[PDB]
Design a protein around this ligand. Structure first.
Ligand code: YQW
Ligand code: ZN
Ligand code: ZN
Length: 232
């Protein structure tokens, strides 16, 4: 009823949306992995009379439910999607999206990693993002490659109309004491990559993590702290 949704308020197999700003929503779903249940976020950005989707809802059935929830709550077509790294919480559901007419995109680095590891593969390559600090425009957002962090390919997304920074899994929520799933991370470079984000988006008003609650700019410094402390 207005609070940011968690696993306790999303009925089994469903997706919830949360209005972040005018024309900007997050999507929240839950999934099980290695015997534990986790929430995960994505983004929806209005693109005229179409919608740009950032990240799947972590699984085929969750992503079908995402499309149905968008039709119920917003009622504009999702025409394009960008996946911000190669893991299943970002690309699992791409096959559903593609069969629903959504054009799916990711960096070439994400596409190679997804293919190599057996995850679903976005159709279209996003060039111009291969060096840290690179940025490109994509409809109503800017895509930014900060450098290796949670994964080597992780991208962040900025909505300039609303000063919304979607950090994806390179950014952790304030309540996290842990650096999350670090299996494919670069803990040594992660602080430097976060510093690049902080430098590039100093006017961000909302910062959304890949999992958990949005907040303000403090999520960036908090992430650097928890990553350094994990490494320690
Ligand atoms: C699909 C994704 C994944 C699965 C379950 C949990 C999380 C978490 C996570 C986030 N907040 N707090 C936590 O306790 C945990 C994060 C995150 O931190 O982004 N991601 C997760 N996976 C799987 C994996 C392992 C590797 C294959 N050997 C691919 O790596 C990864 O990220
Ligand atoms: Zn990941
Ligand atoms: Zn993640």
């Amino acid at each position: 009823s207005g609070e940011y949704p968690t696993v306790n308020e999303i009925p089994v197999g469903e997706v919830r949306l949360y209005q972040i700003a005018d024309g900007v929503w997050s999507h929240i779903a839950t999934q099980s992995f290695d015997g534990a249940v986790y929430p995960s976020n994505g983004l929806i950005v209005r693109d005229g009379d179409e919608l740009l989707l950032i990240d799947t809802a972590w699984g085929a059935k969750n992503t079908a439910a995402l499309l149905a929830e968008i039709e119920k709550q917003i009622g504009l077509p999702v025409t394009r999607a960008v996946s911000t790294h190669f893991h299943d919480d970002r690309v699992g559901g791409v096959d559903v999206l593609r069969a629903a007419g959504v054009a799916t995109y990711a960096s070439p680095s994400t596409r190679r990693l997804a293919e190599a590891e057996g995850n679903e593969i976005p159709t279209h390559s996003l060039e111009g993002l291969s060096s840290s600090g690179d940025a490109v425009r994509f409809g109503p957002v800017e895509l930014f490659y900060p450098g290796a962090a949670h994964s080597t390919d992780n991208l962040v997304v900025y909505v300039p109309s609303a000063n919304v920074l979607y950090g994806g899994c390179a950014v952790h929520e304030l309540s996290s004491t842990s650096a999350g799933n670090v299996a494919d991370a670069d803990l040594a470079e992660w602080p430097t990559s976060v510093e690049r984000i902080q430098k590039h988006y100093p006017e961000a008003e909302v910062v959304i993590p890949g999992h958990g609650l949005p907040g303000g700019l403090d999520l960036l410094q908090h992430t650097a702290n928890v990553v350094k402390a994990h490494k320690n």
